[PDB]
C-alpha cells in the first residue's frame with residue numbers, strides 16, 4: 001500500500017499503564033517508534049534499563065513481534081522533548097557526528113531495531129528548559145542526518161538489511177526557518193510532522209491541540225495563524241519535503257483546563273483557571289478516559305467547531321474544557337493524507353486508545 005502508519009510506543013507504558021508491546025495490534029501499524037533512547041557523552045544510550053533492555057524487557061517483546069509480523073519495522077526514537085540537550089554537541093563536529101552515528105548503528109544491531117528516528121526538539125531555538133542550541137544547528141542538523149544516513153547505509157550493506165532513518169519535526173514553522181528541510185528530506189526515509197501540541201495548558205486560555213485549519217475567531221496573544229495541521233503540512237511541502245515522505249502526526253491524548261469562562265463559545269478560546277482533570281497527570285487525558293468517562297458524560301458536552309474542524313468537550317458546572325481528537329476530525333485528516341499524496345499518519349501514542357477507536361479508523365482508511 002501507499003501509506004505508513006507510525007505508532008509511538010512509550011517505554012513507560014510498562015509501568016502503571018501496564019501496556020506492553022504484547023498489547024499492540026501489529027495489524028494496525030507499519031512502524032513502531034520506541035520512545036525513547038537518551039544521549040550520554042555524545043552517544044545513543046538505553047533510556048530506561050528497568051523496561052528497555054532489562055526488567056520488563058520491552059526490546060525482547062518488540063523482537064518477538066517482528067518474528068510474528070515480518071511486515072513490521074521498529075525504529076528507536078532518540079531524544080524527544082526532555083532528552084534533546086545532547087543533539088547540538090553531537091551534531092557540531094565531524095568527530096562528534098561519527099561518534100553519534102556509530103553509537104546509533106551499535107544500538108539498533110544490539111537491540112534488533114530496523115532504524116533510527118531523530119526527535120531533536122529543536123535546532124537553533126525552542127525545546128525544554130534543559131535544551132542547548134547554537135546558531136550552527138541549522139547546518140549541523142543536515143550534517144548529522146548525512147552522517148547517520150552514511151553509517152546506516154554502510155551497516156545495512158554489512159548486515160544484509162535496510163535500516164531506515166526518520167525524524168520528528170515541529171508543527172511550528174520556525175523549525176523550517178531553522179533547518180534545511182530541502183536538503184535533509186533527501187536522506188530521511190520519511191518525516192513525521194508533529195501536527196499537534198498547537199495549544200495546551202502552557203496557555204492560561206483554551207484552544208485546540210490539533211485544529212485542521214486556521215480559525216480567525218481564535219485571536220489570543222502569540223498564537224500563530226499557522227498553528228493548524230493544513231498550515232504545517234503546506235509549509236513542509238513548500239520547504240521541499242516530498243509529499244510521499246511527509247507523515248501527518250495525530251494525538252491520541254487530549255488536554256484539559258478547569259474554570260474556563262463560557263463566553264459565547266461554550267469555553268472555547270476562553271480564559272481558564274489552570275489544568276483540568278487528567279488520566280496519569282493533571283491536564284492530560286488518554287482518549288480511552290475521554291471515551292469512557294467524559295464524551296457526553298459527567299456534565300461534559302461535545303461541541304464541533306466547523307471552521308477549525310475540531311471537537312471539544314465543555315463542562316459548564318466546572319468550566320472544564322477538553323481538546324481531543326474526535327473521529328469526525330480524524331476522518332478529515334485521513335482524507336487529506338490521500339488527496340495530498342502524503343506518506344501516511346503518525347500518532348502519539350498507542351497506549352492512550354485502549355479500544356483502538358482512533359487506531360482502527362487510521363488502519364481502516366490507510367492500510368490494506
Ligand SMILES: CC(=O)N[C@@H]1[C@@H](O)[C@H](O[C@@H]2O[C@H](CO)[C@@H](O)[C@H](O)[C@H]2NC(C)=O)[C@@H](CO)O[C@H]1O
Pocket residue numbers: 080081121169170171172194196197198199200202227
Ligand atoms: C505551535 C507551538 O509552538 N507549540 C508549542 C508546543 O510545541 C510545545 O509543546 C511541546 O511540543 C512538542 C512537539 O513539538 C512535544 O514533543 C512536547 O512534549 C511539548 N512540550 C510539552 C511541555 O508539552 C509547547 C510547550 O512547550 O509550547 C508551544 O508553544
Ligand SMILES: CC(=O)N[C@@H]1[C@@H](O)[C@H](O)[C@@H](CO)O[C@H]1O
Pocket residue numbers: 080081168194196197251348
Ligand atoms: C506525555 C509526553 O511526554 N508527551 C509528549 C507530547 O506532548 C507530544 O505530543 C509528543 C510529541 O511527539 O512528545 C511527547 O513526549
